[PDB]
Write a protein that binds this ligand. Sequence first.
Ligand SMILES: [Ca+2]
Length: 490
Amino acid sequence: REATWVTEKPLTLKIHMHFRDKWVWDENWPVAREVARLTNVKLVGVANRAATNSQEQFNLMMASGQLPDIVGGDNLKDKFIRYGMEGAFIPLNKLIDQNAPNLKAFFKTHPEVQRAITAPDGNIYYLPYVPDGLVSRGYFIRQDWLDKLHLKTPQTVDELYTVLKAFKEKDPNGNGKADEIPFINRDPEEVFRLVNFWGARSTGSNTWMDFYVENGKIKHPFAEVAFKDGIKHVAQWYKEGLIDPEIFTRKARSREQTFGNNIGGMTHDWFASTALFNDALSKNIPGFKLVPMAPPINSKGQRWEEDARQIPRPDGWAITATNKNPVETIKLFDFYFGPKGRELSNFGVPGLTYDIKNGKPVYKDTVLKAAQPVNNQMYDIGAQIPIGFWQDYEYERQWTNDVALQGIDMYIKNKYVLPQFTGVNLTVEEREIYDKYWPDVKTYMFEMGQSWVMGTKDPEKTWNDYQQQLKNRGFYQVMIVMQKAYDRQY
Ligand SMILES: [Ca+2]
C-alpha cells in the first residue's frame, strides 16, 4: 500500500500505444513498472509490435473491434478530437475538475495549453505531451571538412551549394573514394524544409506540413507558388547528389550511419543529440567537428530557422468509452503531473538511470558518458515517451554539451526562429469539412512532394494538375474554413 495509490484493489488496463513508427508501450519498462507500483495501476499494451506505421495502427485498432481502455501516441490530436466527438473517447473536463488536482492546477496556469487541446464542442479528449524549452533544431556542418578543404562557413545559399558540391567531389575524408553525402537527415520531411533556402515555407510549426499565417491570411506551404519554384531547386540538389539519395528511406539512425562512417557533411536537427556526436565519435574520427551554423541567407535575403519547440505537441493519450474505470484512469494520469510522476516520466527510475543528490534528479555518469543520446536511452525504459506528460528541460540540460549550448544561445540571441503558427479553433461544422478532406489531402501533398524531389515528376509540368487535384480533393474547402476560424479570432 502506498499514499500515491489511486485505487486499493490492484487495477490493470489495456493500452494501445504505437508511436514514432517503431515503438509500443511495454509494461516491462522500468518506468512503467515503477508507476504501476506507486499507483497500483498496471497498463498492458496491445499494439502490433511488428508495425511500421503508427497512424495505420491507430486506424487498424479503430476497426479491430472492442477498443482498449487507453490510446496514446504521437500526432494523434486530430484523431483524438475527431473520434472523441464521435464518442470513441470520453470528455475529461469533469473528471479533471473533480479528481485531478495536479492537472487542474497545471491548466489554470497554462490557459494556452488547455485551449490548444480543446475540441470544437469545448471538450478535452486527451492529455498532451507538453515539451519544455525554446529552440529545437538548427543547422550543423562539418567544420573539420571545411578546414580540410580550406572553405569558409557558407553565409548564403549559393556559397552553401559550393560547399556541399565540394564535400561531394573533393574527397574530404581523404580515402580516395566518392563516398561523401553532403546533406543527411533522420527526418525525411527535412528535405521539404530545404525550400526555405529559396524563400518558401514547408510548415508553420513543429507539426509537419502545418499551415502558417502571413498578413492575416491562412496559407499552406505545399499549395503556394513559392513551393513550386523552391522544390525545383531541391530536386536539382537531389539530382546532383548533394542531398542524401536515401533521404526518404534512411530515417532514424541516419546520424550514426553517416557521421559514424565519416561520410555525412551537414544536417538540420535538434541541438543536444546532434552535438553529442562530437563526443561519441572523438575516439574513432579524431578531427570530427560537427558545429552549429546560422541558417544561410536565403533568396529572400533572410536567415530562417523555421522550427521551434511546440508547446503543447499534438501528442498524448486519451480514455476510451469502453474504459470501465475512468476515475481511476484520470487519477493515474494526474499522477504524471505531480512532482514524483513528472520526475519519473522525464528521468527514468531512481537508482537506475539517476539518483537524487542535493535533492535534485541527477543522471548517473554511465548514462551521460554513453554513446547513445540521453533521450534515446529514456525511450528504451519508458521515459520521454509521447504520453500525457510535462517535460522538464532540466533533464535535457544535463546532456547538452558546450557545442550545443553555444548553438542554442546563438539562435536565441540572433532571433532566427520564425513566429510559429498557434493554430485556430474550428466550430463543429468547420471541423466536419476539416476531418473529411484534410487527412487525404495531406497524404497526397507528401506523395507529390516526394515525386518532385526525386524527379519522377516535374513540379513545373505538373503544377496545374496538382492544383486541380487539391481542388477536387477539397483542399480549398478546408482553406476557407481555416480562414473563417482565423478571422473569428483576430
Ligand atoms: Ca571520400
